[model samples]
Target: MEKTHVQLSLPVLQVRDVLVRGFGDSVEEVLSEARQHLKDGTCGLVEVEKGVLPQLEQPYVFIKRSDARTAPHGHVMVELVAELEGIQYGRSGETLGVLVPHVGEIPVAYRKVLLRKN
Candidate 1:
């Protein structure tokens, strides 16, 4: 049998505090705020559409109190989950691609979680 080597590269990006302010009364408003925060200073942005997950089955948005050490104002909530992968190219030959999805409003229920998925 003959052996061949194939290299598979994965993309990476960092997740940090998504700066946001302003308030909305409805779920749509809140989602909009969350989505906007994802691409605040980026040239290419991800705007959530009505039919993202499904026509009426759009991904849920939730927010709750933040941990004592991490909270900006001492209380915080997950504000959005656009689900759109912000796409980009990698610089090195070993690099493949980069895609970062925006997730908003992680509930207190998940605060203690060591590993979770969006």
Candidate 2:
């Protein structure tokens, strides 16, 4: 018997009743689908590992085999990005965070939007 382990994960969204469809075999397609799905009030996106089974405690949208790719160790990297809401002055926005595998959690603080409204 041979055992295989997951190399990486891809973030995705699980929109209600909308069959996961897109570019067929690319991360960009998944991202595009997520973008449209976010328009609905009942839609949400969840980051999911490629081969690892998702835990019941966490909400995740699993990716298909076509989304998986093999790469040498340290050759690939994944980051946790977030679409944050409720800024002091600015309404809300999205931004990239540190490498996910390296950090347990990315500490985020709502800061000034650095905008001028005179």
Candidate 3:
């Protein structure tokens, strides 16, 4: 068995702050912000999964690190679970379409990373 890991320069709390400021103070908004950050050069997103999980039904975007002693502002590492239903990936491995369940459509102007299908 193998495990997936993600690393970011910023801590979880700081990451939340960035999302709240960039997107809004909501789970959906944070999710949207995360996707956009991944697409744009504003942040860094990486695929650490060496293999896919068969039981993964809901695709997710999350931070792997949980430290709180890091800087308040810095690079935030992110991870995505793309091998699931309701989500699609582009030809270049870019994550496309809506995630897990329906949230709302993310505007293209703010979408430099991942995007919402509807």
Q: List the global CA lDDT of all models.
A: 0.25, 0.25, 0.31
Per-residue lDDT over 1-118 for candidate 3, one digit per residue giving the tens place of the 0 to 100 score: 2123322232122111222222334445556665565444344322224332222223444333223343233422223333224442222232322222212222222212212222
Question: Tens-digit lDDT track for model 1 on 1-118?
Answer: 3122111111112222222222244445545553443335221112223432232122333222222243333222222232222321111111111122334432222121110111
Question: What stretches of model 2 exceed 4 Å from their correct place?
Answer: 1-24, 45-118
Query: Residue 39 deviation, candidate 1, in Å?
Result: 1.1
Q: Tell me the RMSD of model 2 versus the true structure.
A: 18.7
Clashes of each: 5, 0, 4
Q: How accurate is candidate 1 locally (lDDT)?
A: 0.25
Q: Worst ten-residue run, lDDT, model 2?
A: 96-105
Model 3 scores worst on lDDT over the 10 consecutive residues at: 10-19
lDDT of 3 at 28: 57
TM-score of 1: 0.20
Candidate topping lDDT: 3
* RMSD (Å) per prediction: 17.6, 18.7, 14.5
Q: Rank the candidates by TM-score, best first.
A: 3, 2, 1
* Candidate closest to the true structure, highest TM-score: 3
